[PDB]
Amino acid sequence: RAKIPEIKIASRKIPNNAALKFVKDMKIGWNLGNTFDAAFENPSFDDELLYETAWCGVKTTKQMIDTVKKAGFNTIRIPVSWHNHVTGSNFTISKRWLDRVQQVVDYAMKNKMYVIINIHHDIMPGYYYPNSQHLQTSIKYVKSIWTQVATRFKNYNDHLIFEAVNQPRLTGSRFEWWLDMNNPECRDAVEAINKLNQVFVDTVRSTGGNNVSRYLMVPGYAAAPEYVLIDEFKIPKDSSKYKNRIIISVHAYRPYNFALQAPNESGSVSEWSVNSEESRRDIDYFMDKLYDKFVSKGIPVVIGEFGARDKNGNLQSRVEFAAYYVRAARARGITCCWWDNNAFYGNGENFGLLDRKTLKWVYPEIVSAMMKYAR
Ligand SMILES: OC[C@H]1O[C@@H](O[C@H]2[C@H](O)[C@@H](O)[C@H](O[C@H]3[C@H](O)[C@@H](O)[C@H](O[C@H]4[C@H](O)[C@@H](O)[C@H](O)O[C@@H]4CO)O[C@@H]3CO)O[C@@H]2CO)[C@H](O)[C@@H](O)[C@@H]1O
């Protein structure tokens, strides 16, 4: 139904070290989106495990993960929102919830896949919130969640990756998605994120076993490329006797007006062309800056989320986008993970690729476009 383009992007020099070989072997990722990350108050149901299906509508199965592996993905990102699953002053995670998350991790481990688990939609005062006012509780939350999760998974091999937090930011604010680094409120949030990323690393390493050397992903503000590129971002100090085990996490649905902006919002575009510098510009730019600051210096970078939402059937554009984005990243030593939220029609964000109920690929052309350039 679509024509996959022949993409010509020269490879950059990629330092030969273990971390960048690891990221290369991850190859390309698929997010189990809108699954364990679903989060909201006042559930109509009694069984907390129904959060798994409240948004995506389909319970995860081993056959589903098998299907994702068979299509060529070698990484599964399993975002998890924990705040609807904790009780008590020290955020005890419900055993049934953590048990179910572990069952799904096991589906992926059986397929010899890389697996990323995180803290996702927990960005609220009283849980994870990056400012001085709420920092003491945020430290307690990061410490408690990651002590519990890291302990459960301590004897999992290095294919399992921990990601500190998804998109740490101030919410319901002009600064939620953009910083003015001359403003003290923004400087404070960047500092809080540095502190909480250090707490995360220290907490994980302290639990022993394979957690002493496992790869760990950390974002900057809002997981934006810009806010790991600022001078104020700090890679946490790592006590691992293995060097270079911290991976920079970024999310980049770029160009925004094509990939993520809703099609009924003024400014949205539905066309993307491999022959247009206007389509390519924003992809090249942030990847170039990340290559300059991190990859070229040997520091690994993973794009944990990208994608392009369907806009009234714009398949050819999304096919060209996906091929270009994956090749641009691979040429710079970076591996990417598509956000697959099992959403295909309606007014929502229609990022789905796999129809989970049938295990059929709705957009195999997009998958094939990525696989052509992922290795
Ligand atoms: O229909 C069920 C439920 O959907 C809720 O909306 C979901 C979207 O369906 C889902 O695609 C979205 O996924 C996020 C992901 O969790 C984030 O890590 C990241 O967030 C975006 C952010 O949404 C943008 O506003 C911002 O500009 O960019 C970041 C990425 O840089 O990316 C994806 C895609 O947006 O999560 C939503 C929930 O937060 C509806 O809210 C709910 O009403 C529906 O019931």
Coordinates of C-alpha atoms in Angstrom, one line a residue, residues 41-375:
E41 CA -8.6 8.2 39.9
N42 CA -11.9 6.7 40.8
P43 CA -11.8 3.4 38.8
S44 CA -15.2 1.9 38.2
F45 CA -13.8 -1.6 38.8
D46 CA -12.6 -3.4 41.9
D47 CA -9.7 -5.4 40.6
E48 CA -6.6 -3.2 40.3
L49 CA -5.2 -5.5 37.6
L50 CA -7.8 -4.0 35.2
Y51 CA -5.7 -0.9 34.9
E52 CA -3.7 -3.1 32.5
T53 CA -6.6 -3.1 30.0
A54 CA -8.5 0.1 30.9
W55 CA -7.0 2.0 28.0
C56 CA -5.6 -0.6 25.5
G57 CA -8.6 -3.0 26.0
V58 CA -6.6 -6.2 25.6
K59 CA -4.8 -8.2 28.3
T60 CA -1.2 -8.9 27.4
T61 CA -0.2 -12.4 26.4
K62 CA 2.9 -14.3 25.6
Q63 CA 1.6 -14.8 22.0
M64 CA 1.4 -11.0 21.7
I65 CA 5.0 -10.5 22.7
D66 CA 6.0 -13.4 20.4
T67 CA 4.3 -11.5 17.6
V68 CA 6.3 -8.4 18.4
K69 CA 9.6 -10.3 18.4
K70 CA 8.7 -12.1 15.2
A71 CA 8.2 -8.8 13.4
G72 CA 11.8 -7.9 14.1
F73 CA 11.7 -5.9 17.4
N74 CA 14.4 -6.8 19.8
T75 CA 13.4 -4.4 22.7
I76 CA 10.1 -4.1 24.5
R77 CA 9.5 -1.0 26.7
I78 CA 7.0 -1.7 29.4
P79 CA 6.0 1.6 30.9
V80 CA 4.4 1.3 34.4
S81 CA 2.4 3.7 36.4
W82 CA 2.7 2.7 40.1
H83 CA 0.8 5.4 42.0
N84 CA -2.6 3.7 41.7
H85 CA -1.0 0.5 43.2
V86 CA 0.8 1.7 46.4
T87 CA -0.4 1.9 49.9
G88 CA 1.0 3.2 53.2
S89 CA 3.4 6.0 54.1
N90 CA 6.3 4.2 52.4
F91 CA 4.6 3.4 49.1
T92 CA 4.3 -0.4 49.3
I93 CA 3.6 -1.8 45.9
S94 CA 0.6 -4.2 45.6
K95 CA 2.0 -7.7 45.3
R96 CA -0.7 -8.6 42.7
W97 CA 0.4 -5.7 40.5
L98 CA 4.1 -6.3 40.7
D99 CA 3.5 -10.0 40.1
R100 CA 1.6 -9.2 36.9
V101 CA 4.2 -6.8 35.6
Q102 CA 6.8 -9.5 36.2
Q103 CA 4.8 -12.0 34.3
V104 CA 4.9 -9.7 31.2
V105 CA 8.6 -9.1 31.6
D106 CA 9.0 -12.9 31.6
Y107 CA 7.2 -13.1 28.3
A108 CA 9.9 -10.8 26.8
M109 CA 12.8 -12.5 28.5
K110 CA 11.6 -15.8 27.1
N111 CA 12.0 -14.2 23.7
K112 CA 15.5 -13.1 24.6
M113 CA 14.4 -9.4 24.2
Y114 CA 15.8 -6.3 25.8
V115 CA 13.2 -5.0 28.3
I116 CA 12.8 -1.5 29.7
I117 CA 10.7 -0.9 32.8
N118 CA 10.2 2.6 34.4
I119 CA 8.1 4.9 36.5
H120 CA 5.6 6.4 34.1
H121 CA 2.4 8.6 34.9
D122 CA 3.3 9.2 38.5
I123 CA 4.3 12.9 38.1
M124 CA 2.2 14.5 40.8
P125 CA 2.8 16.1 44.3
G126 CA 3.0 13.3 46.8
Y127 CA 4.6 10.9 44.3
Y128 CA 7.3 12.0 41.8
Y129 CA 7.4 15.8 41.6
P130 CA 10.6 17.7 40.7
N131 CA 10.7 20.8 42.8
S132 CA 12.1 21.9 46.2
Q133 CA 8.6 22.0 47.8
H134 CA 8.0 18.3 47.1
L135 CA 11.6 17.0 46.8
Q136 CA 11.6 15.1 50.2
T137 CA 8.6 13.1 49.3
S138 CA 9.9 12.6 45.7
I139 CA 13.1 11.2 47.1
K140 CA 11.1 8.8 49.3
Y141 CA 9.0 7.7 46.3
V142 CA 12.0 7.1 44.0
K143 CA 13.8 5.2 46.8
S144 CA 10.8 3.1 47.7
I145 CA 9.6 2.2 44.2
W146 CA 13.1 1.4 42.9
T147 CA 14.1 -0.6 46.0
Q148 CA 11.0 -2.8 45.6
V149 CA 11.2 -3.1 41.8
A150 CA 15.0 -3.6 41.7
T151 CA 14.9 -6.2 44.4
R152 CA 12.2 -8.2 42.6
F153 CA 14.2 -8.2 39.4
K154 CA 17.7 -8.3 40.9
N155 CA 18.7 -11.7 39.3
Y156 CA 17.5 -10.8 35.8
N157 CA 20.3 -10.6 33.3
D158 CA 21.5 -7.3 31.6
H159 CA 18.8 -7.6 28.9
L160 CA 16.6 -5.9 31.6
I161 CA 17.1 -2.2 31.8
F162 CA 15.7 0.2 34.4
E163 CA 14.6 3.7 33.4
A164 CA 14.4 6.1 36.4
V165 CA 11.2 8.0 35.4
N166 CA 9.4 8.8 32.1
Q167 CA 8.9 12.5 31.6
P168 CA 9.7 14.3 34.9
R169 CA 8.3 17.8 34.8
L170 CA 6.2 20.4 36.5
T171 CA 2.6 19.8 35.5
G172 CA -0.3 22.2 34.8
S173 CA 2.2 25.0 34.3
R174 CA 3.5 27.2 31.4
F175 CA 6.8 25.3 32.1
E176 CA 5.4 21.8 31.8
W177 CA 7.0 21.2 28.4
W178 CA 9.4 24.1 28.0
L179 CA 12.0 25.8 30.3
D180 CA 13.2 29.3 30.7
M181 CA 16.6 28.6 32.3
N182 CA 16.8 32.2 33.5
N183 CA 13.8 31.5 35.7
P184 CA 14.5 30.1 39.2
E185 CA 11.5 27.8 39.1
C186 CA 12.9 26.0 36.0
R187 CA 16.5 25.9 37.4
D188 CA 15.1 24.3 40.6
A189 CA 13.2 21.6 38.6
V190 CA 16.4 20.7 36.6
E191 CA 18.3 20.4 39.9
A192 CA 15.6 18.3 41.5
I193 CA 15.7 15.9 38.5
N194 CA 19.5 15.6 38.8
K195 CA 19.0 14.7 42.5
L196 CA 16.3 12.2 41.9
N197 CA 18.3 10.6 39.1
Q198 CA 21.2 10.2 41.5
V199 CA 18.8 8.7 44.1
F200 CA 17.6 6.2 41.5
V201 CA 21.1 5.1 40.6
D202 CA 22.2 4.8 44.2
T203 CA 19.0 2.9 45.2
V204 CA 19.4 0.4 42.4
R205 CA 23.1 -0.3 42.9
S206 CA 22.6 -0.8 46.6
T207 CA 20.3 -3.8 46.1
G208 CA 23.0 -6.2 44.9
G209 CA 23.0 -9.0 42.4
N210 CA 23.0 -8.0 38.8
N211 CA 21.7 -4.6 39.8
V212 CA 25.3 -3.5 40.6
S213 CA 26.1 -3.4 36.8
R214 CA 22.8 -3.4 34.9
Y215 CA 22.3 -0.6 32.4
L216 CA 20.1 2.3 33.7
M217 CA 18.4 5.0 31.7
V218 CA 17.9 8.5 33.0
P219 CA 16.1 11.4 31.4
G220 CA 16.3 15.2 31.7
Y221 CA 13.3 17.5 32.0
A222 CA 10.2 16.2 30.2
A223 CA 12.6 13.6 28.6
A224 CA 13.3 16.3 26.0
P225 CA 16.6 16.2 24.1
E226 CA 17.0 19.9 24.9
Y227 CA 17.1 19.3 28.7
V228 CA 19.9 16.7 28.6
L229 CA 21.8 19.1 26.2
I230 CA 21.8 22.0 28.7
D231 CA 25.0 22.3 30.7
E232 CA 22.9 22.0 33.9
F233 CA 22.0 18.3 33.2
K234 CA 24.2 15.9 35.2
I235 CA 24.8 12.3 34.5
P236 CA 24.6 10.6 37.9
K237 CA 27.7 9.2 39.5
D238 CA 27.7 5.5 39.3
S239 CA 29.3 3.1 41.8
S240 CA 29.2 0.2 39.3
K241 CA 32.7 -1.3 38.8
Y242 CA 31.6 -1.6 35.2
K243 CA 32.1 1.8 33.5
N244 CA 29.6 3.6 31.3
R245 CA 26.4 1.9 32.4
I246 CA 24.1 5.0 32.3
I247 CA 22.1 5.5 29.2
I248 CA 20.6 8.9 28.3
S249 CA 16.8 8.7 27.7
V250 CA 15.0 11.0 25.3
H251 CA 11.6 11.1 23.7
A252 CA 11.2 13.0 20.4
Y253 CA 8.0 12.9 18.4
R254 CA 9.5 15.2 15.8
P255 CA 8.6 17.1 13.8
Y256 CA 5.9 17.8 16.3
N257 CA 3.3 19.3 13.9
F258 CA 3.4 16.0 11.8
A259 CA 4.1 13.3 14.4
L260 CA 2.2 14.2 17.6
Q261 CA 0.0 17.4 17.1
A262 CA -3.6 16.3 16.7
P263 CA -4.9 16.6 13.2
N264 CA -7.8 18.9 14.1
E265 CA -5.5 21.5 15.8
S266 CA -4.4 24.5 13.6
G267 CA -0.8 24.0 12.7
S268 CA -1.0 20.2 12.3
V269 CA 0.4 18.8 9.1
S270 CA -0.3 15.3 7.7
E271 CA 2.4 15.1 5.0
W272 CA 6.0 14.1 5.6
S273 CA 8.4 13.7 2.7
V274 CA 11.9 12.1 2.6
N275 CA 12.7 14.7 -0.2
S276 CA 11.8 17.8 2.0
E277 CA 14.3 19.5 4.2
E278 CA 11.3 20.9 6.1
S279 CA 10.2 17.4 7.0
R280 CA 13.7 16.2 7.9
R281 CA 15.1 19.3 9.8
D282 CA 13.9 18.7 13.3
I283 CA 14.9 15.0 13.3
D284 CA 18.4 15.7 12.1
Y285 CA 18.9 18.6 14.5
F286 CA 18.2 17.0 17.9
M287 CA 20.0 13.8 16.8
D288 CA 23.0 15.8 15.7
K289 CA 23.2 17.5 19.1
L290 CA 22.8 14.2 21.0
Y291 CA 25.6 12.6 18.9
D292 CA 27.8 15.6 19.6
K293 CA 27.4 15.7 23.3
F294 CA 27.0 12.0 24.1
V295 CA 27.4 9.3 21.5
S296 CA 30.6 10.7 19.9
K297 CA 32.1 10.8 23.4
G298 CA 31.1 7.1 24.0
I299 CA 28.0 7.8 26.1
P300 CA 24.9 5.7 25.1
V301 CA 21.6 7.3 24.1
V302 CA 18.2 5.6 23.6
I303 CA 15.1 7.3 22.1
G304 CA 12.6 5.5 24.3
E305 CA 9.6 6.9 22.5
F306 CA 8.8 8.2 19.0
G307 CA 6.1 7.7 16.5
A308 CA 3.7 9.4 14.1
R309 CA 0.0 9.3 14.8
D310 CA -2.4 8.4 12.0
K311 CA -3.9 11.5 10.4
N312 CA -6.8 10.5 8.1
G313 CA -4.9 7.7 6.4
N314 CA -1.5 9.3 5.8
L315 CA 0.3 6.0 5.4
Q316 CA 2.9 6.9 2.8
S317 CA 4.0 9.9 4.9
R318 CA 4.3 7.8 8.1
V319 CA 6.2 5.1 6.2
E320 CA 8.8 7.6 4.9
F321 CA 9.0 9.2 8.3
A322 CA 9.6 5.9 10.1
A323 CA 12.3 4.7 7.8
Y324 CA 14.1 8.1 7.9
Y325 CA 13.8 8.5 11.7
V326 CA 15.2 5.0 12.3
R327 CA 18.1 5.4 9.8
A328 CA 19.0 8.9 11.0
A329 CA 19.2 7.5 14.5
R330 CA 21.2 4.4 13.6
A331 CA 23.6 6.4 11.5
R332 CA 24.4 8.3 14.8
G333 CA 24.5 5.2 17.0
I334 CA 21.1 5.6 18.5
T335 CA 18.3 3.0 18.9
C336 CA 14.6 4.0 18.9
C337 CA 11.3 2.6 20.3
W338 CA 8.0 3.2 18.7
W339 CA 5.0 4.1 20.9
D340 CA 2.3 1.5 20.2
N341 CA -0.7 2.3 22.3
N342 CA -3.1 0.0 20.4
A343 CA -5.2 3.0 19.3
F344 CA -6.3 3.0 15.6
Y345 CA -9.5 5.1 15.3
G346 CA -11.4 7.8 17.1
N347 CA -10.3 11.2 18.5
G348 CA -7.4 9.8 20.5
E349 CA -3.7 9.5 19.7
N350 CA -3.8 6.8 17.0
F351 CA -0.2 5.4 17.3
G352 CA -1.2 1.7 17.0
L353 CA 0.7 -0.7 14.8
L354 CA -0.3 -4.1 16.2
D355 CA -4.0 -4.9 16.6
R356 CA -3.6 -6.7 19.9
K357 CA -7.0 -8.5 19.8
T358 CA -6.2 -10.2 16.4
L359 CA -2.4 -10.1 16.6
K360 CA -2.5 -8.7 13.1
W361 CA -0.3 -5.8 12.0
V362 CA -2.5 -3.0 10.8
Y363 CA 0.4 -1.0 9.4
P364 CA 3.0 -3.7 8.4
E365 CA 4.5 -1.1 6.0
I366 CA 5.6 1.1 8.9
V367 CA 7.1 -1.9 10.7
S368 CA 8.9 -3.0 7.5
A369 CA 10.1 0.6 6.9
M370 CA 11.8 0.6 10.4
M371 CA 13.2 -2.9 10.0
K372 CA 14.9 -2.0 6.8
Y373 CA 17.2 0.5 8.6
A374 CA 17.2 -0.6 12.3
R375 CA 20.1 -3.0 12.3

